From a paper:
Tyrosinases (TYRs, EC 1.14.18.1 and EC 1.10.3.1) and catechol oxidases (COs, EC 1.10.3.1) are type III copper‐containing metalloenzymes that constitute the class of polyphenol oxidases (PPOs). More specifically, plant PPOs are expressed as pro‐enzymes (55–65 kDa) consisting of an enzymatically active (40–45 kDa) and a C‐terminal domain (15–19 kDa). The C‐terminal domain plays a significant role in the regulation of the enzyme activity inside the cell by shielding the catalytic pocket of the active centre, and in addition it provides an indispensable motif for the accurate folding of the active domain. Herein, we investigated the activation of PPO1 from [name] ([name]) and present a novel activation mode for plant PPOs driven by self‐cleavage, which is independent of external proteases or any other harsh conditions (e.g., SDS).
We recently observed a similar process in apricot PPO, where the enzyme was spontaneously activated upon prolonged storage. The cleavage site was determined by high‐resolution electrospray ionization mass spectrometry (ESI‐MS), which showed that the protein is not just cleaved at one single peptide bond but rather within a sequence of four contiguous peptide bonds (Ser 366–Ser 367–Ser 368–Lys 369–Val 370). The crystal structure of the Ccleaved‐domain starts at residue Lys 369 and ends at Ser 504, indicating that the C‐terminal domain remains stable upon self‐cleavage. Structural analysis of the separated C‐terminal domains, Ccleaved and Csole, revealed a metal‐binding site. This binding site is absent in the C‐terminal domain still attached to the pro‐enzyme. It was concluded that the observed cleavage converts the pro‐enzyme into a pre‐active stage that still requires the spatial removal of the C‐terminal domain (e.g., by SDS or high salt concentrations) in order to achieve full enzymatic activity.
Numbering used by the authors: 370 to 502
The structure:
């Protein structure tokens, strides 16, 4: 488990972190219900000649971390190795839709969720994680 203020981090192993839902959800959990709630993984940085892949999962913040795995796949970041005429590195972002996922895991009443990042290959830095509309 990693605190939100621990980012930026090097994703050398599987990590999880508690991510707050958007502020409007605090007063009314159905605020902005016809808009997609989006998980944003910011400041993804790596050398372009290194293949990168990490997978993203979400679980209910109230689950026991010492208990069985209840994580739900949300998406993946993939980069294929390449060269670039004036950049050694790429600095990018990943956005994943959460609205259906939160309904499926039955966490739509919660104010935060747990986001797990699972590195598969490649050295990569993660700048930050947030949820917004
Ligand atoms: Ca819950």
């Amino acid at each position: 488990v990693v605190a939100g203020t621990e980012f930026p981090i090097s994703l050398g192993s599987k990590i999880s972190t508690v991510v707050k839902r958007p502020k409007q959800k605090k007063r009314s959990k159905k605020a902005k219900e016809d808009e997609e709630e989006i998980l944003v993984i910011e400041g993804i940085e790596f050398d372009r000649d290194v293949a990168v892949k990490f997978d993203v999962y979400v679980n209910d913040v109230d689950d026991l971390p010492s208990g069985p795995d209840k994580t739900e796949f949300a998406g993946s970041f993939v980069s294929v190795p390449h060269s670039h005429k004036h950049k050694k590195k790429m600095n990018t972002i990943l956005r994943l839709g959460l609205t259906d996922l939160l309904e499926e895991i039955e966490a739509e009443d919660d104010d935060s969720v747990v986001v797990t990042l699972v590195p598969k290959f490649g050295a990569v830095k993660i700048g930050g994680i947030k949820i917004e509309f």
